[PDB]
Every structure is written in C-alpha cells, then in structure tokens.
C-alpha cells in the first residue's frame, strides 16, 4: 500500500530529532545545574535585593547562601552616559583602600589617629584633640600654657608684672661717711671715699650725687682768729669736676654725672682734707655722708633753663 | 610606693590601689620581679605624655604576662601627673606599657563601650624629672616615631 | 510482517521519551520564568555594566528595573589569592558604617562635626575651624587672644608694658616739716615727725633719708654770748641711730636705712628740740623738712669704698 | 484494522509535538546564548566570589572577563528586616560621592587638603598640620610665635622684661646751677632757673626738689657790720610756694610738689637775688644747684606725721 | 530693640530689620508672645558662641512655629556680638533657637548652596553679660554636650 | 644669585645648586629668560608660605616648559626662608611655580614615594620684604582663595 512508505518513516526521523534534542538537553541541563549565580531574595514588601551567591537551579532557605563576595580589584563604577570607569579600590602595597575620588564629604564622624594612646582625635560632637599639632592663624585660648613662644611687639600684654622680674635697675643708691681722724677726744672728717659704678646696663644712666654739705670753723682767742679749713675735691675718672674750700660758712657739692652705656666704669673720688686751727689745736670741720643714686636717665619732658 | 630610678632622676608614684586593684597588682608584679629595669621611655610627645615599659635599651620588645582587663571606669581621670596603662586596639589588651600624662588629656577618660585608658597611679615626687624627659629631642620617623634620640633609660625600679 | 513489529512500536517509546522531555521542560521553564537575576545592560561602547535587578527571561527598557539593592550585611570583598574576606559594613547599634579598614586616604574632603552650628569644620581648600580644640606643639598665631594661659620663663616677651601694671613700687617718696612752736612774732621748729614704712613688698628696700640740715644761733649782747641749741634725735624702731647738737654751724643728717622683706614695719622718729637763748629770748633755730625716699635696693654694680 | 488507524496517528501527533518543542527550544536557546550575567569564580578553598561580567553560556579563563561594572546611581543597600533603602552614592554637580550616612568612623587615616602645597595634613601616626586654622580652647604650645594676640589680665606672665620697654618714666632727674654775675675777681649767684615738667604721663607724679641750701655773709670793719643778703623765691605755676632770706646762717629749701595727670605742665621758677655788703663791696652769697626728681607718686604703705 | 533679662544681667540687642525682614519678624513674634521667658542658654562653648531659645529650665524642648527661610545671603557676617539663627541640618529649618557669636566665626558665613547661618541681630549693650555666660562650667556629656552645670535662665524678654 | 625686585622691595636668594641641579637649572632658565617679570604672588597664607611664579596681574596662567623631576630627596628641609618648587598632584609635575616658607613646614619634607616638595633656594637678604608680603589681606573666595586683594608684583627678576 501507499500508506506504508511515508508515515512509517516518520517514526525514524522523529526518533533522530528526539536523539538530537536529547543531546542538546543533556549539554544544556548539565551546565545549568553546574551554574552559580547571584541569588535574589525578597522582603515582605516585594523589594528583590541580592542576598548572596548560590547554585542557580536551587532554592536554599535564605540561609547557607555562601555570601555575596566580590573580588575587590574587579569592582568599578561607571556613568552609563559617557562610559567613565572608576575603580572602587586602589592597591597600596598589599593594602586595599577606597578610591578616595569619592569620600569628599564626612558629617559628624569620629576620627582617631594611629598610636594607642592616640595623638589625634575628632569626636562626632566636634571636640578636637591634636596633641602633636603645628597650627597657624587666629588662636583664641581659654586655658593652657606657652613654653618657648616669641610674643611679638604688636601683641597687647594687658595684665601686670612684678617689680622684680625687671632686668634693669631703674634706680640704685649707695652711701658712705668720710673716714674720721681723731686725736685726744675730738674727731674730724678726713680721707677718701670712692664711688664706682659698673658699666653693666644697656641704657644711659645719671649718677645723682645728693647734696654734700661741708664746712670748717673759726676760733677767736686773745683777738687772734684761727681758721680751720675744709677742702672737698671730687674726681670723675681722675678729672677734677669740683674743688671747694670752706672756712666757717658751708659749701654744698651736688651734681648729676651722666653715665653713657658702653663707655666703661665711672669712678667718683671724694677726698676731704681738714687743716688744724694752729700747730696745737685739732681741726673742727664737718662733712655730710656721700649719698649717690643712679637713675635710668630719661631726658624727655623735664626741661631746665 | 614605687621608685622609677631613671638616668634623668627619680620619679615617686603613689599607686591608686583601691580603685584599680588588679591593674595595680599587675603593675606591682612587673616592678617587683625586675621587669622595668633597663627599659626606655620609647614614646615622648611634649604636651601629651611619655610612654615607657615595653622596649629595652636597643628598641627590643620584652615578653609580658597575659593581658589585664580594662578598669578605666574607676572615675580616675587622665590629669597631669597620672599614669594610665597603655594598651593596643583591643580594649582589654593592656599588659605592661604605661604612660604619664604631662598635661590634661580629657579625650583619654572613659568608662563605656569606648573604654579609654585606666589611670592607676600618680607622680607624687619627681614631676621635674618628667618635665625634663618630656622636652628631649625625638626623631625616629618610620617604624616608631617620637623615640628620644638619646634613650631615657629606667636604671632600676624599687618598691616600698 | 517484520516492519509491523520493528518500526511501529517506535511510535510508543518515542511518545514516552516525548512525555519525559515535556515533564523536564515543564519543570525547568517554570523555574526559568520565575527566576530573578541581576540584569546586565550596555553603553553605546560595549561596556556591559549592572543596571539593576529584573526577571531573567524578560527585556524591560533599562527603565522599571527594580534597582540593584544588596543586603548590606551580605556584601564582603575578597582577595582571590589568599581567600581573606573583608566585610563592607560593620554594625554599631542599628547603624551600619563602612568597614574603615578601607578609608585610609582622604584628599581635599569637606569634614563638618555634629551640632548645627558645627564646632569643627575642614574646608576642601584646607581652611580648618576647631572652636572646641585641645592642641599641643608649635602654635604660630597671627591674631586671637589668650585668656588663662601661663606664659613660661623661656617665652621671649618682645614688646612694651606701662609704668602702671607693675605690682611693686621701685621708688616712693614722702616728706613733712617739723612742728613750729611760736611766741610773740617769732617761730622755731620743735616737735616730732614719724616716718613709718609698711612691710608690704616681697623684695629688700632702702629708706634713703635725703640730707636734713639743722642749726642753732649765736647772739652776743654786752660781751655775753648766748647759744640757742638745736638737737635732732632719730630713732629707728626705738633704737637711736643719730644724735646731733648744733650751736651756730649747721649739722646735716642723712642715712640709707635698710628695709629687708618680712622683718616688719620700719618706724623712723625725727625728734627736734630747740633751747632758748635765755629765760626771755626765744630760740632762733632752723631745721629743713624731713624728706625720705624708699628704693628697691639693688646691691649690684654700685661699689662704695 | 485498529493498529493501522490508531497508533499510526501517534507518529503525526508526535511530529506536531516535536515541532512545538523545537519552536520552544529555538525561542529559549537564542535567549540563553545572548544573555550576559555576573560570573561566579572559585578560590582553591571553595569560596565562590564575583569575578566579573560575562556571557552566561560560556567559560572564559577568569581572564578576558569584562570587569564587574555597576552603574553607580543604581546601587543601594537595604536592611531586609524593615526595607529601608540607602543609596551608595549621592550626585553633587556631575561629581559622585559616597552617601556619608556610612563614613562615621576613621582609624589612622591620611587626610590632606586641596592646594598643592597643602594647608591641612593629618598623618596616620597622628601628627596634625593645620597652617590655615581658627582654634578655640586649651592650647599648650611648646614653640612658635604670637603676632597680634591680646594677652588677657588673668594670664600669668612668669618671665622677665627689660628696664627699657616700659612706657612710663617711674623716675627722672634734672639739675642746673644759678647764673653767676661777677665783678672784679669775685662771683656770686643771682638769676632765674625755670624747671618745667611736661604733663605727658597717665599717672600722678611727685616733683621732689632735693635740698637747696643758700646763705649770705657778714663782714665787720671798724665795728661796722655789713650784711650780704641772699633771697630765694620759688614760684609754682606763678604762685609763690617759698620765700627765704639768709644773712650768714644757711636756709634750705626742699619740697615735694604733687603733679596730677591731666592738670597741665608744672613750671617751677627758682629766683635768686644777692644784695651787696655796701655801695662798693660785691655780695658774698652762696646757693647750691637746683636738683629735681619726678617720681611715679605712690601714696601707699609710707606714712608721715 | 529687645532686652533679654537673664540671671547673669541684661542684653540689649539691636535688630538688623532691613537685611533680614522675615527672620527679625519671626524673632520679634517669639519675644513678643513670651516664648523665650524661662528658657536657658543650653549650649555654651567658650571661644565659639552661646546658644539659647529652644529648651526650658529642665532641659525640655518647647513647641515652635513652622520654620522660616534662610536669609544668610544678606551679607551680614558672624562677627563677635552678632546673633545668627540656629537651625538643624535642613537649610530652611530655622525656627526659634539663636546663638550669639562670642568671637569671629567666618566658617558660619555664606549665602549659597552651603547656606551657613543668618545673622539678624547684634548685642549693643550687655556684652559683659555674654562674656560672663561664655565662661560658665559646662559638663553634660551624653544627650547634649556643653550644657551649663548651673542653668543660665532668661527670666524675661522685653521688646521696645 | 637672583634679584627678585618686587613692588614690596628686593628679595635675595642663594640657589642651593649642588643639591638640586635640575630644579635650579629650570629656575635659572625661567629667571634668565624674563618669565617671572610682571608675575604675582597669587597665594599668600600668613604663617605658612607665599606662592608665586605662575599667574600675571590679571590672574591668568602663563605658558611653562615641560615639567622637571622631583629632587626633594636632596635632604634640604622646608625651613623658614627656603624656596621649594610648587607642583600639582603628580609628584614630577613641578614646572614654574615656587613658594617661600615663611615658617617651619616639617610636613612638606620628604624623599620617598610621598615625594613632598623640593627645596632648592633660600632667602639670604630681603626677608623683611617676605614678612611685609605675608601679612597683606587676602579675599578671593571661589576659584583661587588666599589671593592678595591688591596684588604684589615681581616687577623684574635680574640674575647674577
């Protein structure tokens, strides 16, 4: 019959197609069941997040999913408009850091430095501790201590200082009485007093010699007048600046000797010589102590003459 | 009472034993059994603190005991002259290194999750020694910075 | 025939294989169509980035893709050489932070602290505002104000201070004239002047008594000479340091009394007594005012004798 | 009969089902082979990380994998408990930053600022450099320099200052001798010395006039006594504060004139007049120089009377 | 003119009504309807600023009106003695809290996408009161830092 | 020796030639061929440094040569009065801009991966000119900050 030569060969070509489909299915299924994927799970809202990595043709229980590990050097971020590729991590000698082209904005972070008591600390409420800083510009200290700081001329130093803790002298004083030569029971002044000022100051000074009164005496016996003389002679570095003779009326020596800075020591020599009334009567002379003051020598608003 | 007889002088430390019992026990066991002899103040930052008790004269770390628990919640603060236990990143990792506060370090005080640093001692005499030590020149940029150029050696430690 | 039993039973095993393939296809297709995946899209360059999450067997339009959400606690980064796993986020009491083992390098960020006016602020161009800081080391200020700072001895204080704002006195002066006792139309000096210096200074001082001149008088009537005496007695804390008698020729008292710190108040008593010429004639005596000046007492480069 | 009409149609229906399965296979295989996925690779430990993006039905060699790019604006992190979505990046004017709701904790980072020598720098070991800062609170400097800082009153200023670098004078001094008029071979003092103190100080001052001694003389010839008189007249701002006549016994002028701040210049006029012994004999008078010292005028612990 | 009568003294404030009209309207509406009566300066940082106007004596927050727009681009700067409106993270979130600048705060100045803080007032009298307040001891570590230990109470706000 | 004749005065610079030969060759080639004539110190921060050598009076950038390699490992440090080459982010990108250190800049010193800044010169005379320049008022917030309001101009750059 005709029916035995067309539809009976269908059982063989159908078998050949079934064998080809079996081979394709074996090739594809054995690679589907070996395939690992990123597994998508759900919240109770329909949100579909990445929950980890697992076999594609399985279910798991959202547990025993082997975590979403990414290889760090393989992840980068793109703008899908220009195609600019930005790696997430940068390698620095077996340490991986974030790319830091992000990382442009921190709000209320806590930052601490290395050592373990830390030198640097930034608290999220904004307390800053530096402890190993180098600052410049606009400091308003409420407490603390300066140690080796050069305070400038234009720094206002409102506040007090002690009278001590001033290097210079501003004023000094010194004093001495003339040697007294005596005979019997009467003494008279006679000798030399030397006043030496050491040149150990950066500024000009004046040696104010407070008034020095000296006098002699007069005796009238049997109508004969005997004068007891007094001679005061002052030497400044050997130069005679004064020479006085007093008979019975007083003479007074006072002076302001100038002491410039760097010119060396100033030596003032006060020498008193007394003369006897006669060959027998001891002298009756008087001379007040040597009193001297060295001042800071300001020549400004105090005019004389 | 403990002596730290250093090359700079003598530092007298009164131990706050009633507030940090096990910390001060650990410190006294180290100082008693000759540990801190010939050990340097390896980390000196002027205005901050001076840190010692871990490294020998040639920058060689010593072998400590197993660490101690942090006792920083005793309410003792990191004020000038107090000793706090120095530790690593771990909160209960303090073994042997300590430091003296040369100034007021408020950011090192805490008893919380952020455990801070446990104060257990106070310099009662020889604060001038600590002041001379704090100002020595320190330059070892690299492995350990702020290492004094000429080491500040603790010659011996004597207990009372 | 042989073909009736060898090529007709093939239609049955073929049908069985087709039914088995139908069952496998129904099992696998319902798994493929229900499967969600991470969807890969393309830029106009062939770049193939992750564009979001969507059904695996669908197309979308790069829109309505349900975002690439990752579950935060599930993401970690590996080194695929040693296998070390580093989580991306660390939990801190219902707050998720970055793992901060990255985060080792920040260049030109903006950092601001908590409160809202912030205490700390770091501008990206490098301006720093702390305002609640505790700094140590190398401060180099161009403006500002110290409030309770202890400036140390080794801090150089280049700059000027006022004459006021010095606690000690350095120099003080004081003066008085002796009480005058008068009868008829003539007066003579007689009385006591007391100079007291309070011990309220930390340093040694000198009480410089500027020269005090006093004298009496002589009158000769009918060859009888009458002496009007003048007596000055100076007491330092009750101790007699001077005693003078002047007839007609002047005597001068001057002294530098030492005033050490902590030894108590110094009291200088100037007692001046005048004696009449006779039982009738009032005394004619003179005595200059008491003038005293207290100095800071430097004993250094002012040598005498 | 039945076998040639019942199981014969099995061949045709099997062929129809095979054609339907061929159509489904051609629809699904073309979809599978064109599908890009995220490729999962393996360490030699069984770890299964994300290694990049590649064709789903391929193998590659872990190389030529086209990198794991994510589109930046599409990545966000979820909590799969509440469903809160947090984007990874925030856009800011064509710049992409991390979300900074993470970024709450930095441990030993390196931070530097913009410019290229940077103004700000934070070394990972805790050295801080600010160099363009604005600090408040608790500064403990070990070195550096203040430039325009207002040091407050309650700042302890332990340390010394120079005697100079003090604006006020504290003490000044000035002196001159009286003009001398001479005839024949003898001179006597007579004239005016004017002492003017400029009112250029903020504090009260004292003008201490150190003792000024003047006297005349007496000569007796043929029982006739001639008195050479000396007169000193001192004017303070034109007002007479002293007037003295000396015959042979000396008079001494000394005074402490108060100089208040803001009252104006103080002018002291010392006028000496000498009267001759007779119509022929020149006067024999003496008067010591005018020495004056201006002090800072402390009225505290020094009392007289 | 507005006077804040505090336990420390009296603070006369001149309102810059021409440069910040809405801020000064809001501030005068609060001070007119006794809002700042019995309210503390809850945030005092010496060298920075003193912040008040939102919390009662027991550290409890008051009910404000709905906020006002930021007017910080009026060109007034955060100089010493000026008052700026305090706000939250939101730019136009300023409601009732203000602060007085006790020093020069240049980093709080701007008008731009970084809106800064709107200065609307100035202390013309009682700067000594602000100076005494700025130096009170503050320790409330935890919920709110820099809270004065003894509260600085605004007894009344008197508007002229 | 190089004369930097500016509107403020004259700055005298001894070139550390033996330690930075290529930097000093590049600097002297710019100085010889009148590059720095009529160029401003565009970036002055008091307490830090003053930076010049790239911009004219109108704040426009000039054309430099190909850059020079960093020679910061010569061991010269960023001390007060030394000139270092200014550069961009790239470590070997220094072309023409320099800066004078007005203070001690320890954090700009290194020879390492972190190349720091190469000191090649020192101010020997005219420091006072640098202190006058360092304190001029600067306000150009936006493109370039710390730009002097009234620009300081290198009138001529004469070399010996």
Residue numbers in the entry:
A (entry chain J), C (entry chain F), D (entry chain Z): 828 to 1132
B (entry chain j), E (entry chain f), F (entry chain z): 30 to 189
Task: Quote what the paper states about this structure.
Bacteriophage lambda’s tip protein, gpJ, plays a crucial role when attaching to the cell surface. The gpJ protein, comprised of 1132 residues, is located at the bottom end of the lambda phage tail, serving as a key component of the lambda baseplate. The gpJ trimer not only seals the tail tip into a closed cone but also extends a central tail fiber, providing the means through which lambda phage directly interacts with its host. Genetic evidence has identified the E. coli receptor LamB (ecLamB) as the direct target interacting with gpJ during the phage’s attachment process.
A cryo-EM sample of gpJ713 in its closed state alone was also prepared and collected. A 2.76 Å map of the central tail fiber in a closed state was obtained. The central tail fiber of the lambda phage in the C-terminal region of the gpJ protein is constituted by FNIIIs, AHS, CSF, and RBD (left). AHS is a helix bundle formed by three α-helices, situated below the FNIIIs, securely anchoring the three FNIII-2 units together from the bottom. In the closed state, the longitudinally oriented CSF, a mixed β-sheet prism, exhibits intricate torsion in the strands spanning from above the RBD to below the AHS. From bottom side to top side, its cross-section progressively expands from narrow to wide (left). The RBD, the C-terminus of gpJ, incorporates an immunoglobulin (Ig)-like domain, with four bottom loops (L1-L4) serving a pivotal role in receptor binding. The trimeric plug domains of gpI obstruct the tube, with the C-terminal region of gpH forming a coiled-coil superhelix that interacts with gpI. The AHS and CSF domains within the tail fiber are twisted, and the bottom ends of the three RBDs are in close proximity (step 1).
